[PDB]
Amino acid sequence: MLQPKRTKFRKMHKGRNRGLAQGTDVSFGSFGLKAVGRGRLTARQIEAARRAMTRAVKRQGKIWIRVFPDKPITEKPLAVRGKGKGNVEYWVALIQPGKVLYEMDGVPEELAREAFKLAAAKLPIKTTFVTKTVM
Amino acid sequence: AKTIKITQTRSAIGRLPKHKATLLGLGLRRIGHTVEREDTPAIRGMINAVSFMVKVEE
Amino acid sequence: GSTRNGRDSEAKRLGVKRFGGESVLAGSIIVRQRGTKFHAGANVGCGRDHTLFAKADGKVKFEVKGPKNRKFISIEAE
């Protein structure tokens, strides 16, 4: 599960998630899965979608994960009432509309579409299949 | 030389302090109240600030 | 559980006290600062805590001089 090796700080303000994404182009591969919705992707979701995607292409071609879960999310234990910020439980990437989540190369488009369809079913955010443009 | 007629069209209740001060600066006192003012950039700036609650007769 | 945080210091009310064009008497503090974010120009002194103060009556003037683009404050004798 993706996670920063180290961080300056353990805990982060909730913050907000406004705006449109940077990294909206297929930069590395030929085909991309792009976020159309807004939300958070946990490390577990990123991994689950990766596994489905990889299996679907039978470990042929190459897959880039463009998103990294670098935001720590805390939670308070059950039956606790205050008394300080909770403990870090998991990590997320903030997603905005347009963010390319995954790229893939060295497979037919037909297979890429299938793999990304399987991946998209693991994600809480609405996605769309995209292709590399010349400009 | 030229004057303009300004009329208050909406209430001042619940408006920002600045807006209330602007109506006071124009001399508008109540809904429907019309005043005649010299047409200057200073007056136009005031009208602009509260344009959503005044109408101007040129 | 408990917290190990919960501490802070009093706010020190730093910053610019007299902005550009303001007329000041000699002695008047122009800026309170930690270190010289602004430097003393003409008719301005720098105190031991890097407070910039007027050494003459006049108008405050901010200006950028030198290759580093350092911010100077000076008093235009008026």
Partner: protein
């Protein structure tokens, strides 16, 4: 061979630009050479189909604006972040 029709823009800035795109057009700019920049409107669907072909970015294009023809190359394109639409194109005078 690629020919484009273009009006000259009356209004500019955020409000005007967003109104264009709501009316299925989009803004664009022609610059380069010694002539001053020229701000134009384009029909979206027409140009969207053209630029799908990869020759649009390589070839020299013609922009017919107020009768006059102008030879240009597509310099830069701003796409919509997720929808298949164009927000803006830069054309450099060829």
């Amino acid at each position: 061979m690629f020919t484009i029709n273009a009006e000259v823009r009356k209004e500019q800035g955020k409000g005007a630009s967003r109104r264009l795109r709501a009316a299925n057009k989009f803004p664009a700019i022609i610059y380069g050479g010694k002539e001053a920049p020229l701000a134009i409107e384009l029909d979206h669907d027409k140009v969207m189909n053209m630029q799908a072909k990869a020759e649009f970015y390589s070839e020299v294009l013609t922009i017919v604006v107020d009768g006059k023809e102008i030879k240009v190359k597509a310099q830069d394109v701003q796409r919509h972040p997720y929808k298949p639409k164009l927000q803006h194109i830069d054309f450099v005078r060829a």
